[PDB]
Every structure is written in structure tokens, then in C-alpha cells.
């Protein structure tokens with residue numbers, strides 16, 4: 001069996017943390033159920049897990065900061081709807097893994113869900129924030145679970161998008177229209 005290794009990250013946390021952070025950046029306070037604003041304990045319990053999120057959230061944030069215009073153009077205009085939001089989410093995701101899955105694309109998947117959350121809050125659709133991120137956890141663990149396991153897991157990604165890893169190659173923008 002498997003025991004002691006560099007693989008075992010909870011996609012649920014990688015998402016919630018990503019959405020919880022990306023949302024705070026836009027001045028949004030997403031209430032992912034668990035709300036404990038009275039425990040400033042930064043104990044070294046899950047330092048490794050934090051990296052997968054820090055390096056990940058930083059990886060996408062770096063690309064977004066460069067193409068903020070292209071993002072704000074599609075985001076600000078992105079027509080969100082709880083009736084076809086799930087359907088559109090798949091369309092954007094399908095493109096991400098349409099030509100194959102790679103650490104780069106995986107970055108768009110996380111950045112994608114973040115945009116929707118920020119766009120939902122604008123249209124007074126906070127409830128969507130929980131639905132969007134939720135679909136990410138399921139999708140990530142549904143299909144992206146195996147692939148990531150064969151791509152050295154988040155461990156490999158962390159090394160590719162580590163803190164020292166200067167601005168390297170980017171992912172093909174999921175041009176949808």
C-alpha cells in the first residue's frame with residue numbers, strides 16, 4: 001500500500017483557500033460555512049498543503065496580473081446566470097482540458113472558478129460562490145484527480161511554480177465566445 005509520500009492534498013481546501021483568497025482581494029467576504037475569525041494560530045500543521053495553495057494561487061495570480069485587461073474584458077462582460085452557470089463552467093473547463101491537461105491549464109481551472117465567484121458577488125449572486133467552488137472540488141477530484149497523480153501531484157506543480165521559479169511559460173487562454 002501507500003505510506004509516507006509527497007502526494008495527498010485535499011482539492012476541497014485548495015479550492016476553498018483559492019476562492020477565499022481571490023475573493024478577499026476584490027473586497028469580498030466569502031462565508032464558506034466555517035467561520036472562525038478568532039484563532040490566529042499559524043502553527044506548522046499543514047505547511048506543505050499551504051504551499052500547494054500559495055504556489056497555485058500565486059501561479060494564476062501572476063498570469064492574471066499580466067492579462068488583467070483580457071480578464072476584466074471577459075469577466076466584466078461575463079454574463080453570469082445560476083440557470084446556465086454550471087453549463088458554461090463546463091464549456092470553459094472543457095477547453096482547458098480539451099487539448100490535454102497540463103499544470104498550465106489546471107491554473108485556468110482555478111482562476112476560472114475565482115472569476116465566477118467575483119462576478120457572482122457583483123450581480124448579487126453570492127450563493128453561486130459556494131456552487132462554483134463546489135464544482136471545482138468535484139471536477140478536480142473527479143477527472144483531474146488521476147491526471148495530477150500521474151503528473152507528480154501538486155508536489156511537481158509546486159516545483160514548477162515554486163517561489164524561485166521565475167515567470168515561466170504560460171497556459172493557452174481559454175478563448176470562449
Ligand SMILES: CC(C)OC(=O)Nc1ccc(C2=NN(C(=O)c3ccc(Br)cc3)[C@H](c3ccccc3)C2)cc1
Pocket residue numbers: 074078079080081084085086088089091092096108109111112113115116173174175176177
Ligand atoms: C479563467 C481562465 C480559464 O481563462 C479563461 O478563459 N476564463 C474564462 C474564459 C471565458 C469565459 C466565458 N464564460 N462565459 C460564460 O458564459 C460563463 C457563464 C457562466 C459561468 Br459560471 C462561467 C462562464 C463565456 C461564454 C460565452 C458563451 C459560451 C460559453 C462561454 C466565456 C469565462 C472564463
